Design a protein around this nucleic acid. Structure first.
Ligand SMILES: Nc1ncnc2c1ncn2[C@H]1C[C@H](O)[C@@H](COP(=O)(O)OP(=O)(O)OP(=O)(O)O)O1
Ligand SMILES: OC[C@H]1O[C@@](CO)(O[C@H]2O[C@H](CO)[C@@H](O)[C@H](O)[C@H]2O)[C@@H](O)[C@@H]1O
Ligand SMILES: [Mg+2]
Ligand SMILES: [Mg+2]
Lengths: 412, 556
DNA sequence: CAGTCCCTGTTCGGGCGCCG
DNA sequence: TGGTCGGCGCCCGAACAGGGACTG
């Protein structure tokens, strides 16, 4: 008997209609068990084909969890609700969260099940559960409460949430707390043990409101960037200088102060690639000045809240991956490298999956947004395997690129 | 309450601001007219149909087709205009069951619902839109107007409503009988238990009573107590299954429509018959105008069709699924981007077979295509069995390792082992990571005039070797490839090549072994003959070395 | 600095096969 | 006679997206 906030789609936009993809027997068993209990508790109820909207569903295990978590791919719905959770009931972003020595992430998704959902909106949360070998037709449901992974859930529940919070905010005025979808980011500057302890306190506070909390610990101050770097060589072949000029010329789209004139002079002839070329003093100084510029920041790179984040990833080999986050081309808000992630040297898709997750997490902490990924993989290769390695409760937007690397500019 | 209500109906609105169908009836031949009138009058006694006064201002055509393998006729109401204006549904039929999915069962019963569409009530408010006008032997007698009281064949909401309604009815019985397997596909029900045959039939009849309660009738005529069962186009035996026999047209002269039927049958056959190849038969269908047009068979499509027919000569069968044993998929390269595979558990006892022939990309190699086939098999397996088979692949472990570690795209194959069945899949050539000492360095470039389509391709080298060649009806891209082809032709077994063409460098670095472009194929031919090739890229128009000089030559 | 042209790759709707 | 519905599969060709290189 709680009031239901009415919700509407962005004007001129119909509800999501997205086919359910095939699921493994292990995932289907988990979903059937999860949905049976949710139906019994009234969180969801069965629906007919007259509802014309569907959203994909699947199950994940969070890192080390071993316990299945239902996960709905609400990206299409969230795009059609978009104006609602931005222009009205949204959450501000604590610019200080990235500065805290430790940040823990908690899954508060269960809380959303408390609140009910606008009766007119429930038609849009429909999801079908498939059957192995199509023994049965699809078993369709819809949500009677606030669904996990929908972007209206944290907004509708923000009023309820802040009240549950405010006692703990007032006992610790220095602890920063941020809410992104199903997750609560809790950032303290405390020492490790005190930090973990304060997390238990915020757990109990959630407990006396009837919310269960089954955490991820970050260290955003450790986070660093990956500068463009130029090789150090005792001797330079013609091929080496040709590589260097190509990298510097591309880099000049980012740092306009890069100059290749004196380095180009070294390759005036028509020379064998392996011929050793002594550097002149003028080129040594031009190269020195260049290395310094690349240490510097790009002029006038600042985050813009209106514009979308874009993430680009490159596979550098040997378990190493490089990424750039930006909004405008060549104005990069961050650039980084990942190495020796899970699956290194055996599984590219597991590694790319881990990379997408880590990059999305940083964007949530730094900017409270998730970027759109340009993924260096074939669409069919990614779609076949990615869910197998996914351990997060959100799902970013992605697209697929096929661009081979004419210059290894980012790694070295 | 003139008409009784039987089971939970499904609300069905029209599309907003739109109104019911009106369109005049077909000039139906009197022979057809006889069949409809008898059945339609019978419906009214049951309550399936009701008469309507002209207060119902809706007319939609109607027609009838003979039931295949029966004397009976099927009564179809065309609703193309009503579909257009009826609300959209979400289809609940997510695919087709495959017999290879089925586990072995001691007792199997297949039963068919009778008048299944007609046994499901249509939405009361929506009933008005059904209206159609009956025909007479002459045009003098008007004929009665009728509105369906139940689902009508030919609507676009009929299958999903029936399937969803059928599942709801079955669900209580399934919950009381957790160990019975019911494959529900439309109105056909497959029931399997490990109960002994007498006890199984008790459940079967007990299930029949349950369906009767909702007005669903299972006639004995379509009841299938005894093997071999006929189910989804397959013949089911206690330990094996096979497709119901496939007849391939014998025509001496083939039209276009002929090849389509042929091709589509051979695709159906390839789910069990290993090694079916449709490549050359499909080549005949590319870029043709008339479905009626006659087309002659090449000696390629003929040889293909010959061995395809011979594969069908011997009977083959698949087995059933044993969850205890592993799933194994083995793949063979069939040439010309054709791949076949077998999925099995016991060696030589196949669950099913299949083929992957899709040509993807203008330039590709066998390793990419094998990766595509592995993905197609993996998704197909997850649908049928919910797990990924172990793979036996005709590619050396080191070949795969060299490809995936070096490729710039993320790529992966699930757990697999090498099978030494030729032809093995390999990389035909490898580009060097570093420049080759003592190998001649070819600076290559080409340019072409957008208007004239004239161009030059040429090279310059550190030894002083030079060439420029004029070309006609070309493009900038084509001349950049040509320059590289020239450097490869005119070089020794080891060569360094410097290009500024990102286009060409991208094609060649992906190690293609086949291409749509003949020019790329020739470049491949040369790459294979070399011992060492180093390709390097520099930016154009930067005053670099040989690149500047060759740029001047080809620009001229 | 737009506007093309190449070239590639995706998507989508057509035909057929198969199942109700 | 020619004519309906949904599902899945294949192979096709056309229509569309978008990224570089070059033209003014
Ligand atoms: N050619 C078709 N066009 C439209 N709907 C069809 C067609 N064939 C089958 N269906 C639908 C309607 C049927 O009610 C349902 C089942 O098919 P089917 O079993 O062959 O007929 P039926 O169940 O109505 O009669 P019966 O039980 O005596 O065989 O699937
Ligand atoms: O990965 C491509 C796949 O996306 C689908 C299926 O889930 O769409 C989801 O992912 C897209 C890309 O991030 C979103 O833009 C979209 O809104 C979301 O539903 C597919 O239809 C598409 O083939
Ligand atoms: Mg029937
Ligand atoms: Mg050129």
């Amino acid at each position: 008997p709680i009031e239901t906030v009415p919700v509407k789609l962005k004007p001129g936009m119909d509800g999501p209609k997205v086919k359910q993809w095939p699921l493994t027997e292990e995932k289907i068993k988990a979903l059937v068990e999860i949905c049976t209990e949710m139906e019994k508790e009234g969180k969801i109820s069965k629906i007919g084909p007259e509802n014309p909207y569907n959203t994909p569903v699947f199950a994940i295990k969070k890192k080390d969890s071993t316990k299945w978590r239902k996960l709905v791919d609400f990206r299409e719905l969230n795009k059609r609700t978009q104006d609602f959770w931005e222009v009205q009931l949204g959450i501000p972003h604590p610019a200080g969260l990235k500065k805290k020595k430790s940040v823990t992430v908690l899954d508060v998704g269960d809380a959303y099940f408390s609140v009910p959902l606008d009766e007119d909106f429930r038609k849009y949360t429909a999801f079908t559960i498939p059957s192995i070998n199509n023994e049965t037709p699809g078993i369709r449901y819809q949500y009677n409460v606030l669904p996990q992974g929908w972007k209206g859930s944290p907004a509708i529940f923000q009023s309820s949430m802040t009240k549950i919070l405010e006692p703990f905010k007032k006992q610790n005025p220095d602890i920063v707390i941020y809410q992104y979808m199903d997750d609560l980011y809790v950032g303290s500057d405390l020492e490790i043990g005190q930090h973990r302890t304060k997390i238990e306190e915020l757990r109990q506070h959630l407990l006396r409101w009837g919310l269960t909390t089954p955490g991820y610990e970050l260290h955003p101050d450790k986070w660093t960037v990956q500068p463009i770097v130029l090789p150090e060589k005792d001797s330079w072949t013609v091929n080496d200088i040709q590589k260097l000029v190509g990298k510097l010329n591309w880099a000049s789209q980012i740092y306009p102060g890069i100059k290749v004139r004196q380095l180009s002079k070294l390759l005036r002839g028509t020379k064998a690639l392996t011929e050793v070329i002594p550097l002149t003093e003028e080129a040594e100084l031009e190269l020195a000045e260049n290395r310094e510029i690349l240490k510097e920041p790009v002029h006038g790179v600042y985050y813009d809240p209106s514009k979308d984040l874009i993430a680009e990833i490159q596979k550098q080999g040997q378990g190493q991956w490089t990424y750039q986050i930006y909004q405008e081309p060549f104005k990069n808000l961050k650039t980084g490298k990942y190495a020796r992630m899970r699956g290194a040297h055996t599984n590219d898709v597991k590694q790319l999956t881990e990379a997408v997750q880590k990059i999305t997490t940083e964007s949530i902490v730094i900017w409270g947004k998730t970027p759109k990924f340009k993924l260096p993989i074939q669409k069919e290769t990614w779609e076949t395997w990615w869910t197998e390695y996914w351990q997060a409760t959100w799902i970013p937007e992605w697209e697929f690129v096929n661009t081979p690397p004419l210059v290894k500019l980012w790694y070295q | 309450m003139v008409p009784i209500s039987p089971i939970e109906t499904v609300p069905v609105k029209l599309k907003p601001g739109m109104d019911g169908p009106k369109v005049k009836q077909w000039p139906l031949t009197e022979e057809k007219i006889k069949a409809l009138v008898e059945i339609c009058t019978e419906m009214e006694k049951e309550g399936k149909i009701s008469k309507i006064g002209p207060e119902n201002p809706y007319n939609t055509p109607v027609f009838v087709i003979k039931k295949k393998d029966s004397t009976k006729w099927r009564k179809l109401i065309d609703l193309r205009e009503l579909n257009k204006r009826t609300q959209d549904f979400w289809e609940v039929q997510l695919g087709i069951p495959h017999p290879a999915g089925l586990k072995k069962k001691k007792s199997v019963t297949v039963l068919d619902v009778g008048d299944a569409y007609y046994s499901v009530p249509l939405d009361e408010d929506f009933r008005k839109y059904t209206a159609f006008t009956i025909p007479s032997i002459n045009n003098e007698t008007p004929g009665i107007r009728y509105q369906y009281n139940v689902l009508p064949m030919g609507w676009k909401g009929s299958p999903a409503i029936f399937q969803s309604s059928m599942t709801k009815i079955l669900e209580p019985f399934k919950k009381q009988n957790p160990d019975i397997v019911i494959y529900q596909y439309m109105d056909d029900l497959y029931v399997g238990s490990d109960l002994e045959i007498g006890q199984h039939r008790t459940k079967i009849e007990e299930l029949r009573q349950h369906l009767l309660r909702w007005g669903l009738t299972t006639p004995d005529k379509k009841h299938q107590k005894e093997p071999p069962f006929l189910w989804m186009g397959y013949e089911l035996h206690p330990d094996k299954w096979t497709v119901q026999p496939i007849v391939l047209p014998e025509k001496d002269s083939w039209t276009v429509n002929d090849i389509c039927k042929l091709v589509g049958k051979l695709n159906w056959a390839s789910q069990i018959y290993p090694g079916i190849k449709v490549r050359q038969l499909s080549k005949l269908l590319r870029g043709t105008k008339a479905l009626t047009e006659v087309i002659p068979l090449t000696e390629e499509a003929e040889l293909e069709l010959a061995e395809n027919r011979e594969i069908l000569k011997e009977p083959v069968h698949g087995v059933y699924y044993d969850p205890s044993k592993d799933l194994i998929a083995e793949i063979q390269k069939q040439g010309q981007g054709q791949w076949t595979y077998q999925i099995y558990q016991e060696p030589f006892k196949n669950l099913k077979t299949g083929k992957y022939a899709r040509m993807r990309g203008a330039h590709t190699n066998d390793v990419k295509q094998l990766t595509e086939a592995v993905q197609k098999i993996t998704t197909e397996s997850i649908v049928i069995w919910g797990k990924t088979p172990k793979f036996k692949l005709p590619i050396q472990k080191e070949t795969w390792e060299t490809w995936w570690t070096e490729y710039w795209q993320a790529t992966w194959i699930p757990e697999w082992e090498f099978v030494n069945t030729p032809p093995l899949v390999k990389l035909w050539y490898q580009l060097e990571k570093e420049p080759i000492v003592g190998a001649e360095t070819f600076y290559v470039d080409g340019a072409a005039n957008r208007e004239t389509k004239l161009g030059k391709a040429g090279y310059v080298t550190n030894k002083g070797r030079q060439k420029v060649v004029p070309l006609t009806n070309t493009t900038n891209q084509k001349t950049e490839l040509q320059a590289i082809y020239l450097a490869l032709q005119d070089s020794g077994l080891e060569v360094n090549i410097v290009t500024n063409s990102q286009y060409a460098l991208g094609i060649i670095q992906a190690q293609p072994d086949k291409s749509e472009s003949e020019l790329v194929n020739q470049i491949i031919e040369q790459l294979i003959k070399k011992e060492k090739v180093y390709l390097a890229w520099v930016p154009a128009h930067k005053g670099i070395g040989g690149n500047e000089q060759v740029d001047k030559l080809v620009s001229a």
